[PDB]
Amino acid sequence: PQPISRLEQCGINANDVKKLEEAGFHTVEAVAYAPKKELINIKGISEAKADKILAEAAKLVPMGFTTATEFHQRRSEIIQITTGSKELDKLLQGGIETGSITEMFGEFRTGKTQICHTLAVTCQLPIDRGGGEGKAMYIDTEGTFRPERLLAVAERYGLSGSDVLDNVAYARAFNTDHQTQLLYQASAMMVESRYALLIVDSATALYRTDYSGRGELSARQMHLARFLRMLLRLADEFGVAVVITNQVVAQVDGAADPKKPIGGNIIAHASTTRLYLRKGRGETRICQIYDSPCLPEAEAMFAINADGVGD
Amino acid sequence: PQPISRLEQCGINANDVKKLEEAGFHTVEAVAYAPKKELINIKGISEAKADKILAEAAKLVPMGFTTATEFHQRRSEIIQITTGSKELDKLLQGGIETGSITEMFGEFRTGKTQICHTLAVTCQLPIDRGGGEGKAMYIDTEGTFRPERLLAVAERYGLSGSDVLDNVAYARAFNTDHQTQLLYQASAMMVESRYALLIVDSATALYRTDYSGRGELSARQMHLARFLRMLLRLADEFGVAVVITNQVVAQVDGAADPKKPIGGNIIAHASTTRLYLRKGRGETRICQIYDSPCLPEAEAMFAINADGVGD
Amino acid sequence: PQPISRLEQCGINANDVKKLEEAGFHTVEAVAYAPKKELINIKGISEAKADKILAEAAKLVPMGFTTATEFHQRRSEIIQITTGSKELDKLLQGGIETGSITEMFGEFRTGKTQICHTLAVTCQLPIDRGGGEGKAMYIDTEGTFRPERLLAVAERYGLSGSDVLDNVAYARAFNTDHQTQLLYQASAMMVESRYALLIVDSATALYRTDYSGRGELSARQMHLARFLRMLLRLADEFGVAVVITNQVVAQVDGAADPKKPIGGNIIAHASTTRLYLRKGRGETRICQIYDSPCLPEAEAMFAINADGVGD
DNA sequence: TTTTTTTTT
DNA sequence: AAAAAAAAA
Ligand SMILES: Nc1ncnc2c1ncn2[C@@H]1O[C@H](COP(=O)(O)OP(=O)(O)NP(=O)(O)O)[C@@H](O)[C@H]1O
Numbered sequence: 017p018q019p020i021s022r023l024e025q026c027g028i029n030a031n032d033v034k035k036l037e038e039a040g041f042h043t044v045e046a047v048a049y050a051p052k053k054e055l056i057n058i059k060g061i062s063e064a065k066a067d068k069i070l071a072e073a074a075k076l077v078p079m080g081f082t083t084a085t086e087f088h089q090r091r092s093e094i095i096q097i098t099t100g101s102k103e104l105d106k107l108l109q110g111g112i113e114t115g116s117i118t119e120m121f122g123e124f125r126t127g128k129t130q131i132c133h134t135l136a137v138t139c140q141l142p143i144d145r146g147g148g149e150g151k152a153m154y155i156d157t158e159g160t161f162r163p164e165r166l167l168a169v170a171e172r173y174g175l176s177g178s179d180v181l182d183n184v185a186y187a188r189a190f191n192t193d194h195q196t197q198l199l200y201q202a203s204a205m206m207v208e209s210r211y212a213l214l215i216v217d218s219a220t221a222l223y224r225t226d227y228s229g230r231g232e233l234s235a236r237q238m239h240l241a242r243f244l245r246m247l248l249r250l251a252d253e254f255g256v257a258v259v260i261t262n263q264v265v266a267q268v269d270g271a272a273d274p275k276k277p278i279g280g281n282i283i284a285h286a287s288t289t290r291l292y293l294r295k296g297r298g299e300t301r302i303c304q305i306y307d308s309p310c311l312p313e314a315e316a317m318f319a320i321n322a323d324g325v326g327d
Numbered sequence: 328p329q330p331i332s333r334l335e336q337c338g339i340n341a342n343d344v345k346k347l348e349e350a351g352f353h354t355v356e357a358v359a360y361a362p363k364k365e366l367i368n369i370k371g372i373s374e375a376k377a378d379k380i381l382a383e384a385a386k387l388v389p390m391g392f393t394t395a396t397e398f399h400q401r402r403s404e405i406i407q408i409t410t411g412s413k414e415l416d417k418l419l420q421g422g423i424e425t426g427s428i429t430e431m432f433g434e435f436r437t438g439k440t441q442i443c444h445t446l447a448v449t450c451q452l453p454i455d456r457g458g459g460e461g462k463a464m465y466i467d468t469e470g471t472f473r474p475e476r477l478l479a480v481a482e483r484y485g486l487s488g489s490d491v492l493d494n495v496a497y498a499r500a501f502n503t504d505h506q507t508q509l510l511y512q513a514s515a516m517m518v519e520s521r522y523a524l525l526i527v528d529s530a531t532a533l534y535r536t537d538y539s540g541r542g543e544l545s546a547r548q549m550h551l552a553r554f555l556r557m558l559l560r561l562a563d564e565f566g567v568a569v570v571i572t573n574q575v576v577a578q579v580d581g582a583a584d585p586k587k588p589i590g591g592n593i594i595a596h597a598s599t600t601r602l603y604l605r606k607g608r609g610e611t612r613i614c615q616i617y618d619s620p621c622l623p624e625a626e627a628m629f630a631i632n633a634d635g636v637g638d
Numbered sequence: 639p640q641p642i643s644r645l646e647q648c649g650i651n652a653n654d655v656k657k658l659e660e661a662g663f664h665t666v667e668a669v670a671y672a673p674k675k676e677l678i679n680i681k682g683i684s685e686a687k688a689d690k691i692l693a694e695a696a697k698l699v700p701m702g703f704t705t706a707t708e709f710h711q712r713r714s715e716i717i718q719i720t721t722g723s724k725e726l727d728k729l730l731q732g733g734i735e736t737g738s739i740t741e742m743f744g745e746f747r748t749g750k751t752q753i754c755h756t757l758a759v760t761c762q763l764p765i766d767r768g769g770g771e772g773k774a775m776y777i778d779t780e781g782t783f784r785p786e787r788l789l790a791v792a793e794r795y796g797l798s799g800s801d802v803l804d805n806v807a808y809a810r811a812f813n814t815d816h817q818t819q820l821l822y823q824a825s826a827m828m829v830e831s832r833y834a835l836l837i838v839d840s841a842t843a844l845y846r847t848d849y850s851g852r853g854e855l856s857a858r859q860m861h862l863a864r865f866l867r868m869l870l871r872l873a874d875e876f877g878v879a880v881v882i883t884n885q886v887v888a889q890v891d892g893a894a895d896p897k898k899p900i901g902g903n904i905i906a907h908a909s910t911t912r913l914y915l916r917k918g919r920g921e922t923r924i925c926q927i928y929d930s931p932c933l934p935e936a937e938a939m940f941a942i943n944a945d946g947v948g949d
Numbered sequence: 950t951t952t953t954t955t956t957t958t
Numbered sequence: 959a960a961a962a963a964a965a966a967a
């Protein structure tokens with residue numbers, strides 16, 4: 017939450033600063049987490065300038081060794097937002113954390129985008145209810161976003177729907193490259209008001225249709241790695257929350273399970289957490305954890321009512 | 328364990344010594360293992376000064392031929408720390424050695440960072456239990472570090488959790504270049520109190536996202552070689568232990584196994600040891616050795632309980 | 639095997655001789671193979687003195703034309719040491735020769751250092767078994783040397799392990815320049831007792847991490863050429879044997895094989911022989927010749943048992 | 950002369 | 959069962 021204007025200090029030119037602004041950098045911490053080469057490659061910058069700049073990023077953000085205790089005390093206050101249902105709150109142990117990346121595993125009709133809606137509204141609850149009190153931006157990439165459902169959840173939690181829709185900064189990606197511009201604009205929007213959550217329904221879906229590899233493929237992974245790193249660039253700074261929804265890739269000639277998310281290893285190593293969603297009978301659905309260091313594997317039911325997620 | 332102040336002797340200027348301090352050198356042995364050119368390139372140093380300096384490094388640290396017997400007698404006392412479970416102690420033949428580099432091979436959900444936690448606590452056990460009695464520094468590079476698990480292992484071994492967390496010098500890298508500064512600061516911290524273990528979850532992960540080669544690539548390997556050499560600079564001096572966790576790179580158009588760690592040859596040649604981790608059913612996991620001169624290939628189960636590694 | 643004291647003759651001053659001793663020269667033949675300029679450049683020497691000196695080197699060592707027959711008769715007695723397994727003895731046609739330089743081509747886990755161990759012990763066998771009866775010096779440069787394995791081979795050949803370890807003059811290089819001092823000390827040790835074999839695991843490995851060229855590079859090759867020439871200076875005098883282990887450099891944008899040893903041409907032209915080692919299934923490994931004038935290309939299996947090299 | 954990266958259905 | 963393609967120091 018530290019604007020570059022604070023770096024408009026110690027002899028840096030304000031127009032040099034406004035050169036820096038155009039990189040999509042807008043906070044001192046973003047400069048602190050910027051690799052030297054990215055900062056060099058942009059034109060009109062001698063490396064010594066970067067010595068000054070990075071010296072200032074160190075000047076504001078400490079980057080040394082830290083006690084495990086202090087880290088624990090800073091871990092004490094992560095919000096971990098409620099999902100809007102109890103059993104998920106038990107699975108996730110209080111729900112999805114801020115400052116992290118999450119994952120929807122499903123085949124279809126698993127209510128993953130549904131959960132994205134309910135989270136999108138429930139971030140706006142007062143913190144006592146677990147909401148981050150943070151405006152929510154929703155990067156849809158299939159156009160499947162439904163305001164009507166947001167009004168339904170608005171009925172569900174008693175807040176006026178108009179207030180809910182006043183936030184929820186919907187955006188509609190098409191090109192794989194477009195998502196990048198949407199990220200830089202996101203970072204541009206982060207400066208003004210503490211947002212709660214980024215959601216992405218199908219970060220991966222564009223990558224199937226565009227990169228018919230291999231390939232390709234080696235380019236596809238090449239792009240995803242940067243995308244996910246940028247998501248870390250946001251999440252490591254402004255908490256809020258990162259949600260990723262993945263289409264599924266069914267194996268052939270496997271054993272006994274015919275699933276696994278597309279995107280290969282690079283997605284898998286990146287996410288702090290992972291989830292998997294099998295349909296039950298009727299509305300009922302089954303969550304099941306993968307790859308969360310915080311938690312033992314667990315599984316649970318939830319119905320998708322008119323209010324969606326519940327019991 | 329020999330501070331440069333001992334080299335504040337034989338006519339070397341104390342301010343020349345304090346020029347040397349800034350190189351990240353802080354021990355006489357580090358000077359002894361310093362190549363001539365690195366010592367020259369830093370400003371304010373005539374080569375004759377380096378003749379004096381190196382003459383003193385020889386003056387304190389012997390560097391001649393040695394009997395195999397003597398080397399055996401010095402090999403007799405390496406701690407090789409317990410992993411916190413018996414079957415791993417059998418695989419590794421008493422567990423991970425001090426003075427060496429180690430490797431986690433996994434795809435995801437293989438509990439490699441898990442093992443990093445349990446080691447991070449178990450270094451603090453009394454030596455009879457195999458702990459090096461050495462403070463542990465943990466260079467995380469995905470932010471996935473969990474103090475809570477350290478408290479769990481603290482329950483597991485009966486030591487108070489607060490004492491465990493009093494050490495564990497967590498540090499949070501972002502830039503690829505940042506890891507270097509964290510290394511020099513590490514070497515700076517080595518002087519004060521004998522540490523047990525360096526851990527790095529993902530030394531390699533930054534290198535994917537930053538160097539989208541080739542490339543690049545030729546620069547990426549160029550950087551990794553120095554990084555690993557520095558890890559040798561630490562490990563060859565202060566024992567403790569070096570742990571490396573590697574994301575995986577799945578082959579395409581191979582035969583029959585679709586794995587191999589990224590980083591290419593340069594990582595592979597460097598490590599004294601190597602490990603590989605396939606998930607079993609349930610919590611159970613399978614370790615399997617690569618590239619350990621000390622040991623025949625072997626493999627074994629272990630569950631990841633609430634206490635993590637065990638049976 | 640001719641000490642400089644024999645040159646303490648024909649009017650040369652004994653203190654001039656003891657000036658010469660400091661050059662790392664310790665044998666008359668070394669003086670005979672010394673280029674005029676190296677001998678001049680060292681201080682306190684007029685060129686006429688070098689006329690005397692070289693005249694004496696000619697006075698003891700003949701350096702004229704020789705019949706091919708005589709050379710054959712002197713080729714008749716080269717030991718070519720057994721490798722400790724039969725099929726390698728067939729490939730190498732009786733095993734590695736004395737008076738020569740050899741090469742390990744591998745990617746990792748190819749058992750090259752393993753073979754270095756078994757050779758290191760098997761030089762000590764009586765000559766009927768092919769051992770040179772020569773003490774062995776082992777210049778490790780990754781610290782990976784394991785006395786335990788030497789004890790294992792000692793079990794393998796029935797000689798007491800303590801006697802084996804009584805030799806095996808282990809030495810631990812770090813700097814690229816350090817290897818040079820280790821060479822001059824080696825030559826200093828050659829005078830006292832006929833050694834069998836020099837081994838070097840990774841002559842090349844330091845050169846990657848230190849010279850991140852190009853460069854550099856032009857300096858790197860500049861150093862390697864001298865290093866290899868010195869290895870010839872030893873090998874051309876005292877037989878014994880020279881073994882070189884090379885890390886691998888995988889090509890990009892090649893055809894169909896993604897290998898070749900680092901060090902470029904200068905290593906390649908130097909070695910009398912060359913070997914290449916592909917892993918087989920299980921312990922089994924595959925040797926394959928390069929660049930041996932003596933031999934047609936061939937290839938063969940060998941297992942790496944608890945006793946290492948065998949069948 | 951140096952330097953491997955990538956899964957889909 | 960069966961599927962390529964990718965530089966720059
Ligand atoms: N009006 C409704 N009444 C009851 N249940 C509903 C209603 N609308 C949606 N649902 C539930 O929500 C699900 C919607 O599928 P969902 O999995 O949320 O979309 P998705 O996972 O994104 N699949 P995709 O089309 O690829 O985006 C339906 O299968 C129902 O279970």
Ligand SMILES: Nc1ncnc2c1ncn2[C@@H]1O[C@H](COP(=O)(O)OP(=O)(O)NP(=O)(O)O)[C@@H](O)[C@H]1O
Pocket residue numbers: 284285286287288289306307308309310311312313433435436437438439440441469471610631632633
């Ligand atoms: N609360 C818990 N209860 C039981 N098992 C757990 C719990 N938390 C973590 N685990 C186990 O630990 C694993 C964590 O994955 P792990 O492989 O340790 O992370 P990772 O290898 O670093 N993958 P990455 O996300 O790329 O860092 C889970 O898959 C579970 O097997």
Ligand SMILES: Nc1ncnc2c1ncn2[C@@H]1O[C@H](COP(=O)(O)OP(=O)(O)NP(=O)(O)O)[C@@H](O)[C@H]1O
Pocket residue numbers: 595596597598599600617618619620621622623624744746747748749750751752780782921942943944
């Ligand atoms: N105890 C053991 N039992 C069986 N086989 C073993 C044992 N110890 C070592 N080996 C074998 O020896 C190999 C050691 O690798 P090796 O190629 O000899 O080291 P290296 O080639 O020098 N690689 P590097 O680490 O870069 O030095 C293992 O891969 C095994 O095949």
